[PDB]
Amino acid sequence: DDEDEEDDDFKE
Amino acid sequence: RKETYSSYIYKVLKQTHPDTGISQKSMSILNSFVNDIFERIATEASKLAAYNKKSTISAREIQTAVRLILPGELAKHAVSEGTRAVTKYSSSTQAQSSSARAGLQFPVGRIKRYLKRHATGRTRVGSKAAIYLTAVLEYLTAEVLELAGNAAKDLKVKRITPRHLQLAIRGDDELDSLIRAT
């Protein structure tokens, strides 16, 4: 999940 | 073009895992999936209509194509969703939107137009063909999202990342087969 740190939330 | 389905993917995620979010990278991957599967089904359905000299791509050609493309039981599950959608729309006394009439989040009218890009010459595309394809694309997206959301909950995280998508696809042998072919 450090993996995902630069992967922002999709915002509706 | 490759089209964007992210809004509609998110609507499906809200029905499947109301409490769970999804990362931008995950959404890009799902949008590629939808486009890829669309292209495979549409190409095959259009081929069926052409080889059989039909004037219209109909729900029969979509249904056949789904049975040729989706592996294992997944194909029969998906056929049932397409058939259900067509039935709901039909029994719809409606001045409602095509998608709403069929019970779908994915955009029927748009998908009908995209499908027309695969129809050569005089060949037409039926409304029920587009309902059925929409329903299959939505169902597949729901299957992946359900599984990936469960992987996320298993890892006590509150959104779907690409790793949960991998876990989902890798742990279902039919989806794994589908994605390896696509």
Author numbering:
A (entry chain C): 79 to 90
B (entry chain A): 1 to 182
From the article:
H2A.Z is an evolutionarily conserved histone variant of H2A and is essential for the viability of metazoans. Chz1 is a major chaperone for H2A.Z in yeast and has several reported nuclear functions. Overall, this study shows how Chz1 utilizes 2 binding sites to cooperatively recognize the Z-B dimer, ensuring the bioavailability of the histone substrate of SWR1.
To reveal the structural basis for recognition of H2A.Z-H2B dimer by Chz1-FL, we reconstituted Chz1 complexes by mixing recombinant Chz1 containing residues 64–153 with yeast scZB at 1:1 molar ratio and determined the crystal structure of Chz1-MC in the complex of scZB at a 1.65-Å resolution. The final model contains Chz1 residues 142–153 and is missing residues 64–141 in Chz1-MC, likely due to the partial degradation of Chz1-MC protein. Consistent with the aforementioned CSP mapping results, the complex structure showed that Chz1-C interacts with the H2B L1 loop and α1 and α2 helices, as well as with the H2A.Z L2 loop. The binding of scZB and Chz1-C, which buries a total area of 494 Å2 (calculated by protein data bank in europe, proteins interfaces structures and assemblies [PDBePISA] program), is stabilized by both hydrophobic and polar interactions. The side chain of Chz1 residue F151 inserts into the shallow hydrophobic pocket surrounded by Y45, I57 in H2B α1 helix and M62 in H2B α2 helix. In addition, Chz1 residues E144, D145, D148, D149, and D150 form salt bridges and hydrogen bonds with R86 and R90 of H2A.Z as well as S58 and Q59 of H2B. Because equivalent arginine residues are also present in H2A (i.e., R79 and R83), this interaction is not sufficient to determine H2A.Z specificity (but see below). We refer to this common histone binding site as the DEF/Y motif hereafter, reflecting the consecutive D/E residues followed by a single aromatic residue. Taken together, we conclude that the DEF/Y motif of Chz1-C directly engages the arginine residues in H2A.Z L2 loop and a hydrophobic pocket in H2B for Z-B dimer interaction.
